[PDB]
Design a protein around this ligand. Sequence first.
Ligand SMILES: C[C@@H]1C=C[C@@H]2CCCC[C@@H]2[C@H]1C(=O)c1c(O)c([C@]2(O)CC[C@H](O)[C@@H]3O[C@@H]32)c[nH]c1=O
Ligand SMILES: C[S@@+](CC[C@H](N)C(=O)[O-])C[C@H]1O[C@@H](n2cnc3c(N)ncnc32)[C@H](O)[C@@H]1O
Ligand SMILES: C[S@@+](CC[C@H](N)C(=O)[O-])C[C@H]1O[C@@H](n2cnc3c(N)ncnc32)[C@H](O)[C@@H]1O
Lengths: 393, 393
Amino acid sequence: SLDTLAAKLIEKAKDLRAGNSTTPQQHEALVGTLKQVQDAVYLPRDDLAAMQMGFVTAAAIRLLLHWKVFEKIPDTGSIRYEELATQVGGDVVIITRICWLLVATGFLVQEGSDRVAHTARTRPFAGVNPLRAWWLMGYDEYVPVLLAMPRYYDTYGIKEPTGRLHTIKAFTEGSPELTVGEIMSRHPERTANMLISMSAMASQYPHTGFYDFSWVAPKAAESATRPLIVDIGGAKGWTLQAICKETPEIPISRCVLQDLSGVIQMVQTVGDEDIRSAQLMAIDFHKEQPVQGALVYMIRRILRDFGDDECVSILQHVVAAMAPDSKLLIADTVTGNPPSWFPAMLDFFLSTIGGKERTEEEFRKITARAGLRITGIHYSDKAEFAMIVCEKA
Amino acid sequence: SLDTLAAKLIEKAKDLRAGNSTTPQQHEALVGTLKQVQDAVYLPRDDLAAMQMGFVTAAAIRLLLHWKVFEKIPDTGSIRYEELATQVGGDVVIITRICWLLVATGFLVQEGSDRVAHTARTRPFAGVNPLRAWWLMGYDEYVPVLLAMPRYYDTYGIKEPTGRLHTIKAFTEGSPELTVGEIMSRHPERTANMLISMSAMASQYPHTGFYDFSWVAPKAAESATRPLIVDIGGAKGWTLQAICKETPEIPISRCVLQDLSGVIQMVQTVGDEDIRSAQLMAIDFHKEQPVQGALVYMIRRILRDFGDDECVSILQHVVAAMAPDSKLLIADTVTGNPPSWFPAMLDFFLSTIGGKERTEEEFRKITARAGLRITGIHYSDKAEFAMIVCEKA
Ligand SMILES: C[C@@H]1C=C[C@@H]2CCCC[C@@H]2[C@H]1C(=O)c1c(O)c([C@]2(O)CC[C@H](O)[C@@H]3O[C@@H]32)c[nH]c1=O
Ligand SMILES: C[S@@+](CC[C@H](N)C(=O)[O-])C[C@H]1O[C@@H](n2cnc3c(N)ncnc32)[C@H](O)[C@@H]1O
Ligand SMILES: C[S@@+](CC[C@H](N)C(=O)[O-])C[C@H]1O[C@@H](n2cnc3c(N)ncnc32)[C@H](O)[C@@H]1O
């Protein structure tokens, strides 16, 4: 309510004066309560005006990023608009107007009518880091594709976009005959920025803590030979390291990390010693699963990027390699009907590359097509992200 | 401070509880306080989530508009996703995914496992009205222009855009040699949406309530042929109709509605019998004011669209047409420096068409340059909007 929002501000204010730390939980609660109140108080005209303001604050930030203006505002203190203008080599009038939008929305602050300064909300824009890279990737790589969606669906029909080709992204780029990866390989600066972005999203879903892997331990004791955990598209092997740290009775030396040649090579070169002890293998999971009869095959945050038919192709290569008692673990969001806001947002972005966040029913359908049955779903505490346990039907 | 904000929330909650928070000024003030809270508490991760969710929610709304889904969701009650999908001839899965994004953000409501319903936030999209037209103007006609701003300033220099040609909007449209008004006026559906959008956001741009025209009624008796009010760039004459409703002694047949050829012709189609009984007239106010000697020349929300020199040029043509007892009335947004929240948003948008929001002193400098004397400024008590009353100096 308005009053509980006021209570949370009074609390924050006292804890700052007392120099104590706002927890992530208290911050979330404060922001959540603000949102509840705005949703109760704002009329439709307020909702839509706030949305349009969002467009222009993002454009203003983008334009100042383009002009390298955030780099020139000092970390603390302030800089005269005229000095900014001289250092950019542009007109002080337009630079000041752009800054004023950000002052009116609390991104920047003025110190006297002549000078501008950062807030905590703009310091990430003053240099290279993952939030800024992620911000630029979303704005430059996705916003034009979102604008292109009505034209896309006019062209292809009102149909779920499910292919690796003719994605909304590739359509927007002008090369629908290419995959998104092929398009990005033609764009080295955009890829570089994306690589930094890519690291941030991976870090924010849990690798362990919500599923018991220790049942692999007795098999490792019975069999000296059977491969234990195969991580398909495991990247730099962070998941395998986390599992074997959590349960040291699972020898990482009997696990298998599969990815692209370039990623495996970087693991072999600068990967830590535990992961380098695992069996590393370059594969194409669209065409093959080379490890036969492993106890566990894991597919983490991969199926969300593909349509059903492509997921069933990946899955069936694994099922052909599975022994009768193998498990196939899919780590991915099992979205609700209806979904919560963060997976619902991710799903909307995934539609531009042919993927989606599936419901439990949708996962049942694709695993059954691959000859699997889901025997358990173990949810983490983060936005319906779950371990889906599958065995041969 | 967090504490003064908390106290403002607490006091507005009291007013609501007693039934004493009725007025538009009170609503606007509470909305402003909530925005101040947002700005004081949001951190980069919150701003990023809000940017992403804003763009995604906008594109979802745009697709459901384009597909005529909002029109098919009943005003109350609910409809099955499968019925919606069949009525728009679309795939139920992609339609559901997109509705689900709006369900997750409280724009739509899902009933059970498979039905969807309007909220007050989406009913504006279910049919033709000014708020919907305003939203479509912003999204269709300005968001793609926002994305073009980096390239525009790389093309023309980091300089305040002040010309009526080669605006950012005409640059994006691919017709730099047309003014933005000419571009809007050449396509019927764009023109018709523009006309309806000029009736939106009366909370910022009231059409009456702040200036009393009743002094015109007398002079209507002085003569039978003299034009009483000339509405320069008057769109579809909504403001003339508002004035004549409130001063029924001013006959609308003695008023002149002037706009571009394409706009004034559309008034034959959409205007009611009342406005179509006015003197409709195509003009180009960059070049001429063809009606000499009128009692009042009204220039409402025109000067905002142009730079200072072009505004002087426009006013000079009107001054030449004026008789010694004529008045020239400028009706427009009048803000402070820096601009308040809503005019700060508009100032940024107006930069893409060569315009800006202005302070009272900025309007005074333009009117002086055009050889006018201001005899009165009459502010709205609900919006930063005023009638500037002028005569020949
Ligand atoms: C330009 C401005 C863009 C963003 C704001 C917020 C989002 C809703 C649209 C609204 C819009 C608006 O308020 C105005 C506006 O639409 C125009 C024009 O599009 C540009 C000139 C044409 O001759 C015709 O008059 C229409 C001129 N002047 C304005 O003030
Ligand atoms: C979404 S990313 C990270 C997935 C990883 N399981 C995780 O949770 O962090 C997908 C990974 O799959 C890899 N990959 C993409 N295509 C592949 C292919 N055809 N064969 C093998 N690996 C692939 C990428 O190199 C990337 O490391
Ligand atoms: C921002 S709208 C304001 C409309 C109306 N006076 C109001 O306030 O609701 C700008 C108006 O000026 C008209 N316009 C633009 N350029 C014009 C021109 N060169 N000559 C005549 N009208 C023009 C547009 O077609 C549009 O109706």
